[PDB]
Design an enzyme around this catalytic site. Structure first.
Site, PDB file in Angstrom:
ATOM      1  N   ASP A 171       0.845  -1.185   0.000  1.00 45.25           N
ATOM      2  CA  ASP A 171       0.000   0.000   0.000  1.00 45.25           C
ATOM      3  C   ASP A 171       0.884   1.241   0.000  1.00 45.25           C
ATOM      4  OD1 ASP A 171      -2.595   1.382   2.207  1.00 45.25           O
ATOM      5  OD2 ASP A 171      -2.149   1.707   0.078  1.00 45.25           O
TER       6      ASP A 171
HETATM    7  N1  LIG Z   1       3.400   5.144  13.574  1.00 44.91           N
HETATM    8  C1  LIG Z   1       2.834   6.273  13.081  1.00 44.91           C
HETATM    9  N2  LIG Z   1       3.541   7.415  12.934  1.00 44.91           N
HETATM   10  C2  LIG Z   1       2.978   8.537  12.443  1.00 44.91           C
HETATM   11  N3  LIG Z   1       1.690   8.626  12.061  1.00 44.91           N
HETATM   12  C3  LIG Z   1       0.866   7.555  12.155  1.00 44.91           C
HETATM   13  C4  LIG Z   1       1.409   6.294  12.683  1.00 44.91           C
HETATM   14  N4  LIG Z   1       0.402   5.404  12.673  1.00 44.91           N
HETATM   15  C5  LIG Z   1      -0.693   6.037  12.182  1.00 44.91           C
HETATM   16  N5  LIG Z   1      -0.416   7.317  11.874  1.00 44.91           N
HETATM   17  C6  LIG Z   1      -1.390   8.285  11.317  1.00 44.91           C
HETATM   18  O1  LIG Z   1      -2.686   7.680  11.325  1.00 44.91           O
HETATM   19  C7  LIG Z   1      -3.198   7.559   9.995  1.00 44.91           C
HETATM   20  C8  LIG Z   1      -3.835   6.196   9.796  1.00 44.91           C
HETATM   21  O2  LIG Z   1      -2.847   5.186   9.988  1.00 44.91           O
HETATM   22  P1  LIG Z   1      -2.993   3.800   9.193  1.00 44.91           P
HETATM   23  O3  LIG Z   1      -2.761   4.083   7.729  1.00 44.91           O
HETATM   24  O4  LIG Z   1      -2.178   2.741   9.899  1.00 44.91           O
HETATM   25  O5  LIG Z   1      -4.558   3.502   9.414  1.00 44.91           O
HETATM   26  P2  LIG Z   1      -5.475   2.691   8.374  1.00 44.91           P
HETATM   27  O6  LIG Z   1      -6.823   2.533   9.035  1.00 44.91           O
HETATM   28  O7  LIG Z   1      -4.755   1.473   7.856  1.00 44.91           O
HETATM   29  O8  LIG Z   1      -5.583   3.803   7.216  1.00 44.91           O
HETATM   30  P3  LIG Z   1      -6.006   3.457   5.705  1.00 44.91           P
HETATM   31  O9  LIG Z   1      -7.501   3.671   5.681  1.00 44.91           O
HETATM   32  O10 LIG Z   1      -5.232   4.473   4.902  1.00 44.91           O
HETATM   33  O11 LIG Z   1      -5.567   2.025   5.508  1.00 44.91           O
HETATM   34  C9  LIG Z   1      -2.016   7.745   9.059  1.00 44.91           C
HETATM   35  O12 LIG Z   1      -2.395   8.449   7.874  1.00 44.91           O
HETATM   36  C10 LIG Z   1      -1.022   8.542   9.870  1.00 44.91           C
HETATM   37  O13 LIG Z   1      -1.201   9.931   9.593  1.00 44.91           O
HETATM   38 CA   LIG Z   2      -2.867   4.229   5.497  1.00 46.09          CA
HETATM   39 CA   LIG Z   3      -4.219   0.423   6.016  1.00 48.11          CA
END
Ligand SMILES: Nc1ncnc2c1ncn2[C@@H]1O[C@H](COP(=O)(O)OP(=O)(O)OP(=O)(O)O)[C@@H](O)[C@H]1O
Ligand SMILES: [Ca+2]
Ligand SMILES: [Ca+2]
Ligand SMILES: [Ca+2]
Ligand SMILES: [Ca+2]
EC number: 2.7.1.95
Length: 270
Positions: A197
Site C-alpha cells: 500500500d
Molecule cells: N506510527 C505512526 N507514525 C505517524 N503517524 C501515524 C502512525 N500510525 C498512524 N499514523 C497516522 O494515522 C493515519 C492512519 O494510519 P494507518 O494508515 O495505519 O490507518 P489505516 O486505518 O490502515 O488507514 P487506511 O484507511 O489508509 O488504511 C495515518 O495516515 C497517519 O497519519
Molecule cells: Ca494508510
Molecule cells: Ca491500512
C-alpha cells in the site's frame, strides 16, 4: 524412565502490561484512517516519545496482526515505526508503535505544491531501496495468485467496498471488476519486496526528508507494479507530470499499462 516430561512448579512472573506504560499520556483520535481499525496518537508526556495505538477487531484484528509481524521483519531494512507493545486475543489485536514525526507525503504535496518534483524524487529513491532488498530475505508472500484468492474471499463475504472503487468503475458490481480484471491476465511476474500500500498517506516527510513508512500489513513478495500502480494512482490526483516523473526516476521510461491496470483493479478488493 528418568526425568519427568513436566515438573510441577509455581507461577512465573508475567509481563508488565499497557497500564504501566500508557500512564501520563494525552490522547488524540485519528480521523485519517478508513480501514476500520481504531487509531489513537499518544502524546504530551514529558521525557517520553509520542506513540500510536492501532486496534483491530474481528477480521481487522488479523489485519493488525499481519501489520505487526511485517513491521517486525522489515524494520531491519527500512525506516519503520518501532514496536513498543502488541497484544492478540481471539477477536482483538492492539498495536502500539512509535510515532514517526512529520507530515505524510499527501499533506506536503498539498501544503507545498512547488515541492512536488522533490517529493516525487524522494519517493522514487525510497521505492528503489525497498525493491532492492533481496527476495530471499522476505518470509512474506503477496504474489498475485495469493492476492487474487484473497480478493475472491473478500468478494464472496461481501466485504468489498464499492464506494471506494475508482472513477472508472463507479457503479460497477464487484463481480464485473473481478471478471474484467482476469481478462488482463496473464503477465510475466517481476517479483521484488513490495510495500502493498505505497500510497501518499503511508509515507512520512520530516524537515524535507522521507524518514519512514507505515501501514505495512501487505508487505511481501509481489510484482513491482504492486507499489508502482498505487503510487501512480495517488499522484494522478495532483499531476500527470508527477506521475511521469515517478517512473522516470524509478528507472522505467514507459509504464506497463496492463500491469498498471491489473494492480489498480486488484486494489479495489481491499
Ligand atoms: N506510527 C505512526 N507514525 C505517524 N503517524 C501515524 C502512525 N500510525 C498512524 N499514523 C497516522 O494515522 C493515519 C492512519 O494510519 P494507518 O494508515 O495505519 O490507518 P489505516 O486505518 O490502515 O488507514 P487506511 O484507511 O489508509 O488504511 C495515518 O495516515 C497517519 O497519519
Ligand atoms: Ca494508510
Ligand atoms: Ca491500512
Ligand atoms: Ca479513526
Ligand atoms: Ca479503490
Amino acid at each position: 524412565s528418568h526425568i519427568q516430561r513436566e515438573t510441577s512448579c509455581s507461577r512465573p512472573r508475567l509481563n508488565s502490561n499497557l497500564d504501566a506504560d500508557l500512564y501520563g499520556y494525552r490522547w488524540a483520535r485519528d480521523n485519517v484512517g478508513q480501514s476500520g481499525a481504531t487509531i489513537y496518537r499518544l502524546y504530551g508526556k514529558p521525557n517520553a516519545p509520542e506513540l500510536f495505538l492501532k486496534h483491530g477487531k474481528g477480521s481487522v484484528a488479523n489485519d493488525v496482526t499481519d501489520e505487526m509481524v511485517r513491521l517486525n521483519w522489515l524494520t531491519a531494512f527500512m525506516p519503520l515505526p518501532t514496536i513498543k507493545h502488541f497484544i492478540r486475543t481471539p477477536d482483538d489485536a492492539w498495536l502500539l508503535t512509535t510515532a514517526i514525526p512529520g507530515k505524510t507525503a499527501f499533506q506536503v504535496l498539498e501544503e507545498y505544491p512547488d515541492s512536488g518534483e522533490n517529493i516525487v524524487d524522494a519517493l522514487a529513491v525510497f521505492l528503489r531501496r525497498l525493491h532492492s532488498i533481496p527476495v530471499c530475505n522476505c518470509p512474506f508472500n503477496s504474489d498475485r495468485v495469493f492476492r487474487l484468492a484473497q480478493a475472491q474471499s473478500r468478494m464472496n463475504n461481501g466485504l468489498v467496498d464499492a464506494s471506494d472503487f475508482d472513477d472508472e468503475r463507479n457503479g460497477w458490481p464487484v463481480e464485473q471488476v473481478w471478471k474484467e480484471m482476469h481478462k488482463l491476465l496473464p503477465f510475466s511476474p517481476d517479483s521484488v519486496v513490495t510495500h502493498g500500500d505505497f500510497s501518499l498517506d503511508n509515507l512520512i516527510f520530516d524537515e524535507g526528508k522521507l524518514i519512514g513508512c507505515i501501514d505495512v500489513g501487505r508487505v511481501g513478495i509481489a510484482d513491482r507494479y504492486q507499489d508502482l500502480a498505487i503510487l501512480w494512482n495517488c499522484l494522478g490526483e495532483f499531476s500527470p507530470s508527477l506521475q511521469k516523473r515517478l517512473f522516470q526516476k524509478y528507472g522505467i521510461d514507459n509504464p506497463d499499462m496492463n500491469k498498471l491496470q491489473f494492480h489498480l483493479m486488484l486494489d479495489e478488493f481491499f
